[PDB]
PDB file of C-alpha atoms and ligand atoms in Angstrom:
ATOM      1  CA  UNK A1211       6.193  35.445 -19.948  1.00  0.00           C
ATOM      2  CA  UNK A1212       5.142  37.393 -16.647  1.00  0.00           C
ATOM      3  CA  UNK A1213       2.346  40.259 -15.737  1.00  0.00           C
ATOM      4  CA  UNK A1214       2.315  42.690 -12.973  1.00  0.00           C
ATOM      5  CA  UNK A1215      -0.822  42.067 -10.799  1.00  0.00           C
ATOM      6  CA  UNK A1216      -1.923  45.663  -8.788  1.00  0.00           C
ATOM      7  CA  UNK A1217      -5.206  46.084  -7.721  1.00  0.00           C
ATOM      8  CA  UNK A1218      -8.129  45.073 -10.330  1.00  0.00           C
ATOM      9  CA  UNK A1219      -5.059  44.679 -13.169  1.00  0.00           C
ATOM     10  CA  UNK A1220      -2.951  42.561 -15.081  1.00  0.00           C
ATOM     11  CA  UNK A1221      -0.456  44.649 -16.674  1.00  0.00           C
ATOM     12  CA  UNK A1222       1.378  42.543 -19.510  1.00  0.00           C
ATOM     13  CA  UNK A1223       3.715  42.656 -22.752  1.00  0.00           C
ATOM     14  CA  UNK A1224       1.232  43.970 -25.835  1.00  0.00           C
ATOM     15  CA  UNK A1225       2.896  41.727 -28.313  1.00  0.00           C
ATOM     16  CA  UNK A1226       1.904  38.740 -25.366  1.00  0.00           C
ATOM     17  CA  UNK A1227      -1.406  39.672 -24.776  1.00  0.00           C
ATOM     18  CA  UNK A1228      -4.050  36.500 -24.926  1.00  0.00           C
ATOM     19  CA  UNK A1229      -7.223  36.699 -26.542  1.00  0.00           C
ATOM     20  CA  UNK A1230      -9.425  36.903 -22.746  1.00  0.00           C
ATOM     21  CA  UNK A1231      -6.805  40.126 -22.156  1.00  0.00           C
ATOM     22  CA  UNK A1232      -7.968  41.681 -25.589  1.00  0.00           C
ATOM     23  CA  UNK A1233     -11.541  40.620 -24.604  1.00  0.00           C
ATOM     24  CA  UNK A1234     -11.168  42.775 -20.937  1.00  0.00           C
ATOM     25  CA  UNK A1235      -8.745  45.379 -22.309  1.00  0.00           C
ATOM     26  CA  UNK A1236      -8.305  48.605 -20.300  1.00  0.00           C
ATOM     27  CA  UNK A1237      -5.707  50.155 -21.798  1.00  0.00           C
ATOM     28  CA  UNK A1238      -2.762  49.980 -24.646  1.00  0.00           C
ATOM     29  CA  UNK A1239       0.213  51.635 -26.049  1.00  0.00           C
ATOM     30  CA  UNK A1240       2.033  49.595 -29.146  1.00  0.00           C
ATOM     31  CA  UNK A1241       4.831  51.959 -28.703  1.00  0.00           C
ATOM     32  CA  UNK A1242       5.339  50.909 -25.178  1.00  0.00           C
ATOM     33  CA  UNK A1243       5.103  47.407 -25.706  1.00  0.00           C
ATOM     34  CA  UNK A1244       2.417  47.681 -22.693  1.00  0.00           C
ATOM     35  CA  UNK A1245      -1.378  46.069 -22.601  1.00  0.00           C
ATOM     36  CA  UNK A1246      -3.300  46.331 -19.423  1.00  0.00           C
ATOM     37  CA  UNK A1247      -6.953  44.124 -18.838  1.00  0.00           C
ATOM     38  CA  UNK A1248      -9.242  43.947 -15.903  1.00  0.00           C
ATOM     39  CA  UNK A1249      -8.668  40.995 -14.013  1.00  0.00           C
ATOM     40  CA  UNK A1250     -11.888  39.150 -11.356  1.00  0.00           C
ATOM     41  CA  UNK A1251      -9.181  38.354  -8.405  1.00  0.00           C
ATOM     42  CA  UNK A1252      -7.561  41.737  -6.562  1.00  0.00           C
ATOM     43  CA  UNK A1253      -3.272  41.123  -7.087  1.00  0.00           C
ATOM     44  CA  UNK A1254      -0.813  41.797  -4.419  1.00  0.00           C
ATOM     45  CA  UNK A1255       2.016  44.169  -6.219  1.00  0.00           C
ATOM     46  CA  UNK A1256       2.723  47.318  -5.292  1.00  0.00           C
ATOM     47  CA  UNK A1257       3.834  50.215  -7.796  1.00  0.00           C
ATOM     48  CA  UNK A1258       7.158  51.923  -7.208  1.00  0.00           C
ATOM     49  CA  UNK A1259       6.489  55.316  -7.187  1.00  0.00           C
ATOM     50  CA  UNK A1260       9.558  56.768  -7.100  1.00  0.00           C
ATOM     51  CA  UNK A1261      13.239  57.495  -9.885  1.00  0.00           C
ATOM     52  CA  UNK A1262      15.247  55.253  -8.483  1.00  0.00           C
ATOM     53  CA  UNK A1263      17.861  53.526 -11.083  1.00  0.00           C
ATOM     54  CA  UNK A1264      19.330  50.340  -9.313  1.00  0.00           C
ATOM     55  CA  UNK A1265      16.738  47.280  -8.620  1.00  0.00           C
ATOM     56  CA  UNK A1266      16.532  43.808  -9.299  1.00  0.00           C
ATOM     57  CA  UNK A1267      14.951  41.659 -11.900  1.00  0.00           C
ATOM     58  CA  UNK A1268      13.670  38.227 -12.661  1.00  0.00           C
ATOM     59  CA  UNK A1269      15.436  36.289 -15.496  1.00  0.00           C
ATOM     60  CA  UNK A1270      13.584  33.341 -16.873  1.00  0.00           C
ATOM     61  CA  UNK A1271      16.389  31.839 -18.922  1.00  0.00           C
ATOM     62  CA  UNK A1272      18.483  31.764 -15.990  1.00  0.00           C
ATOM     63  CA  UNK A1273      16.123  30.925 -12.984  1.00  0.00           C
ATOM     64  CA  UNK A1274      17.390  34.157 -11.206  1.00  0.00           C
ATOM     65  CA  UNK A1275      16.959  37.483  -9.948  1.00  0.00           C
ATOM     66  CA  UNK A1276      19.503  40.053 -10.696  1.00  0.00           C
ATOM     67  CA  UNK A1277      20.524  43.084  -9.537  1.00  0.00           C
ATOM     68  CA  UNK A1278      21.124  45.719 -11.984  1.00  0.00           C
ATOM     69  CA  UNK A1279      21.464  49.568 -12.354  1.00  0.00           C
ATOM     70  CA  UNK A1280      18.993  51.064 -15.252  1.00  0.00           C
ATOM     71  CA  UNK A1281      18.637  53.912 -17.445  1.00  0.00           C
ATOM     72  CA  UNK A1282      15.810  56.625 -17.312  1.00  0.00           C
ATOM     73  CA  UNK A1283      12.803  56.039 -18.948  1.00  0.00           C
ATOM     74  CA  UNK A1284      13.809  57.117 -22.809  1.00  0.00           C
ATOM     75  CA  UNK A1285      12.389  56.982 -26.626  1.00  0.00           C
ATOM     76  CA  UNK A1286      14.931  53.609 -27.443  1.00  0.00           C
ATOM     77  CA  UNK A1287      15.214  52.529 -31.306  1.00  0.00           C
ATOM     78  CA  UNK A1288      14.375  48.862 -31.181  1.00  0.00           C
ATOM     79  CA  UNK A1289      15.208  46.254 -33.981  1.00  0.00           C
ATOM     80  CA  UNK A1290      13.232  44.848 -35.915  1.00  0.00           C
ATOM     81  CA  UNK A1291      11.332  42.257 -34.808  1.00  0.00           C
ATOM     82  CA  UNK A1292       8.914  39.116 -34.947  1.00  0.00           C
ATOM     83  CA  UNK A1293       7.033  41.545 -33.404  1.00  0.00           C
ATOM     84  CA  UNK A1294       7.093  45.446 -34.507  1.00  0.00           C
ATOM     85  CA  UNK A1295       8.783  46.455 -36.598  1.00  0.00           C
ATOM     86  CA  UNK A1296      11.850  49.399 -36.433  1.00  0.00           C
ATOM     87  CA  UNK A1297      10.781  51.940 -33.900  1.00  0.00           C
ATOM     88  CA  UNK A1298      11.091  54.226 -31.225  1.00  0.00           C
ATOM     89  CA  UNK A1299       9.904  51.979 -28.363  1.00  0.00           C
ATOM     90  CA  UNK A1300       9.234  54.559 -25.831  1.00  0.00           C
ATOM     91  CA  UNK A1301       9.432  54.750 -21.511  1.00  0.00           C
ATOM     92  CA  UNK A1302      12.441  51.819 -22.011  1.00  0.00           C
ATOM     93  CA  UNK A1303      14.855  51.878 -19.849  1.00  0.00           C
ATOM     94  CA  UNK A1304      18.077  49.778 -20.684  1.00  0.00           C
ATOM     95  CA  UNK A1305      20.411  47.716 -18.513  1.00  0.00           C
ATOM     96  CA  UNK A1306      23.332  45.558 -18.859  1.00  0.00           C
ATOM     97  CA  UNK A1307      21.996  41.917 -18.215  1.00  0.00           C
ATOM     98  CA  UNK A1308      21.303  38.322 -19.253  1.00  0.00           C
ATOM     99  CA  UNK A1309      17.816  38.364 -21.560  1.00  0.00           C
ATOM    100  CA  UNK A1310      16.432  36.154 -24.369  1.00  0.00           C
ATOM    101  CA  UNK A1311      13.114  35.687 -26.052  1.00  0.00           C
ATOM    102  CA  UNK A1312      11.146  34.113 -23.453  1.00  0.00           C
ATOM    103  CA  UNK A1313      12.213  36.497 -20.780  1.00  0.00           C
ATOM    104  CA  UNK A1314       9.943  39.381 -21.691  1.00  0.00           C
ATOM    105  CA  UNK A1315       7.043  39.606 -18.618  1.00  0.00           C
ATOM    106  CA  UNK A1316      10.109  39.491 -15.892  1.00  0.00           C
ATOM    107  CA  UNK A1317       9.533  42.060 -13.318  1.00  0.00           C
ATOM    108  CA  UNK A1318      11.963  44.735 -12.347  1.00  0.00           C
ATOM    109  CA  UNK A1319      11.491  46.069  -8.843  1.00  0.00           C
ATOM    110  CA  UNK A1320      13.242  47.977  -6.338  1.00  0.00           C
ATOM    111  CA  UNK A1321      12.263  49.045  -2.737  1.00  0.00           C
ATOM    112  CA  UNK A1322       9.414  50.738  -2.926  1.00  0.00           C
ATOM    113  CA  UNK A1323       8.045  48.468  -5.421  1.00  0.00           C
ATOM    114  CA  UNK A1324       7.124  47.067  -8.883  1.00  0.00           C
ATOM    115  CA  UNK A1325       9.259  49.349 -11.715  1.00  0.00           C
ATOM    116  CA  UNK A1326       8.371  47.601 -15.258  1.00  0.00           C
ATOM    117  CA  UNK A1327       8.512  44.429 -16.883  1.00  0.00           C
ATOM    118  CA  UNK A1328      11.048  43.039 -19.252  1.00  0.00           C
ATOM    119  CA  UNK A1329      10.381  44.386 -23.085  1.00  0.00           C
ATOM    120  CA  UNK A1330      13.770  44.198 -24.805  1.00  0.00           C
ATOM    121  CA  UNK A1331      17.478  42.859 -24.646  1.00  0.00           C
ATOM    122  CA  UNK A1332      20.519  43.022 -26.323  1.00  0.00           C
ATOM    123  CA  UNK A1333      24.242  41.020 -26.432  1.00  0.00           C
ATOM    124  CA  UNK A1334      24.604  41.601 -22.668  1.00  0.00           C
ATOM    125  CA  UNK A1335      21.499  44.179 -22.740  1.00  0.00           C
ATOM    126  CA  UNK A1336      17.745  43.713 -21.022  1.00  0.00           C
ATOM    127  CA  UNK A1337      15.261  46.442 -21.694  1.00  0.00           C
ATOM    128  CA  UNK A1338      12.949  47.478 -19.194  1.00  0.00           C
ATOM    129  CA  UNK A1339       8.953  49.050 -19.672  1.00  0.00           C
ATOM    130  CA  UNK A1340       8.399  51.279 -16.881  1.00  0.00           C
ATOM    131  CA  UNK A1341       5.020  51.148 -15.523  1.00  0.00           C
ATOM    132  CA  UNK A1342       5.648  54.315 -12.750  1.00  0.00           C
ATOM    133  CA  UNK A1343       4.018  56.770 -14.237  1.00  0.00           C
ATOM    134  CA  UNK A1344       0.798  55.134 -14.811  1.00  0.00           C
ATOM    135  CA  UNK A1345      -0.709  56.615 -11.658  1.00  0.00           C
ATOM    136  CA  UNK A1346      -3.949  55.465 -12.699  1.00  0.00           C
ATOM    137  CA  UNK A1347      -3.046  51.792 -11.819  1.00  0.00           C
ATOM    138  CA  UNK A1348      -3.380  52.374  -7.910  1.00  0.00           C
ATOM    139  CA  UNK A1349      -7.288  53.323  -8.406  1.00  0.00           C
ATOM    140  CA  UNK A1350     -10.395  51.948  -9.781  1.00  0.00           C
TER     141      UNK A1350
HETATM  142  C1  LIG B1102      20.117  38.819 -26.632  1.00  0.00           C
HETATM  143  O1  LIG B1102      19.681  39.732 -27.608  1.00  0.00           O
HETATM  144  C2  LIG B1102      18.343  39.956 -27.658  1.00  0.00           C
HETATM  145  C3  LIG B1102      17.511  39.803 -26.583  1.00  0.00           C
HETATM  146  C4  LIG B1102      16.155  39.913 -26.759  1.00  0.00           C
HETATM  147 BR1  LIG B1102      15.085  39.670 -25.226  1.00  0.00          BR
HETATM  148  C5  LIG B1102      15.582  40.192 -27.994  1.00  0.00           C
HETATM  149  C6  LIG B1102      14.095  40.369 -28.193  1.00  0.00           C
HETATM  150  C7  LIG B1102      13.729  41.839 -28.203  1.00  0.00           C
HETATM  151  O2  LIG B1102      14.502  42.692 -27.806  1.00  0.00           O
HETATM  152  N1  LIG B1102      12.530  42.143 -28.727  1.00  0.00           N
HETATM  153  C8  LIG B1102      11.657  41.102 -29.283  1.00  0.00           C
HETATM  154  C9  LIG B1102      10.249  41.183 -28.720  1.00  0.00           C
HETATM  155  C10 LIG B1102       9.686  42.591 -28.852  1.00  0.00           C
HETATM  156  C11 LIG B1102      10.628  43.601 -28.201  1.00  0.00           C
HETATM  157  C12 LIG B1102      10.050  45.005 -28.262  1.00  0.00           C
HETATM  158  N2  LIG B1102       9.563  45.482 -27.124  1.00  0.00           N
HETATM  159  O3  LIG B1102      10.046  45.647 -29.314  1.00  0.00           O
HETATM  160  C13 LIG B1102      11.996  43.497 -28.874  1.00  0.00           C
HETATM  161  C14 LIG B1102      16.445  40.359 -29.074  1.00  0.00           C
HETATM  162  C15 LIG B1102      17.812  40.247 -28.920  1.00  0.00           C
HETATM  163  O4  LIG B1102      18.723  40.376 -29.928  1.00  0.00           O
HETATM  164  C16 LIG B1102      18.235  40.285 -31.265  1.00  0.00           C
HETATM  165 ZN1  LIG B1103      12.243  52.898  -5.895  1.00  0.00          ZN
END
């Protein structure tokens, strides 16, 4: 679990989405794994706007933050899942890292700010959904 909190936002996994983030939707993208809803409270992240490939990124399962070095946002084919089923998941970028089903929410940052949030992962692999070109985020 995990959401990105920027401005008047809570940017979260689609296939976690509650009912009250359904109920105050702004915007989602199945093929992203991405679902963003209007939140009451301002949050305190900060959007990387930038291409770099190295951050760091929070790993439930193992209490820790890692550092890792991350592909470029690409269309990724993702297995089947509990969840969707096999598809081009697009804007995932892939790294070579601890995940599990639980992890998904983490957030993957580096120094200029919040990157994405933990989508997929692998034997060895974690997936990342970039958020930095959602420009709109940083506005109304
Ligand atoms: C350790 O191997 C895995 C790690 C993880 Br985390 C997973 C889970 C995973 O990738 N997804 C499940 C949730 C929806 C996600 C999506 N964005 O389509 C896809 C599987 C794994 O293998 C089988
Ligand atoms: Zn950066």
């Amino acid at each position: 679990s995990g959401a990105i909190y920027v401005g008047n936002y809570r940017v979260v996994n689609r296939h976690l989405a509650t009912h009250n983030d359904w109920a105050n939707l702004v915007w989602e993208d199945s093929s992203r794994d991405l679902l963003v809803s209007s939140t009451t409270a301002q949050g305190c992240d900060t959007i990387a706007r930038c291409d770099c490939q190295t951050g760091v990124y929070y790993c439930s399962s193992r209490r820790k933050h890692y550092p890792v070095s991350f592909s470029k946002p690409s269309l990724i084919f993702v297995e089947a899942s509990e969840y969707y089923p096999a598809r081009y998941q697009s804007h995932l970028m892939l790294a070579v890292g601890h995940s599990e089903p639980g992890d998904c929410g983490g957030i993957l940052r580096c120094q200029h700010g919040v990157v994405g949030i933990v989508s997929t992962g692998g034997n060895g692999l974690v997936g990342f959904a970039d958020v930095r070109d959602l420009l709109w985020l940083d506005e109304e």
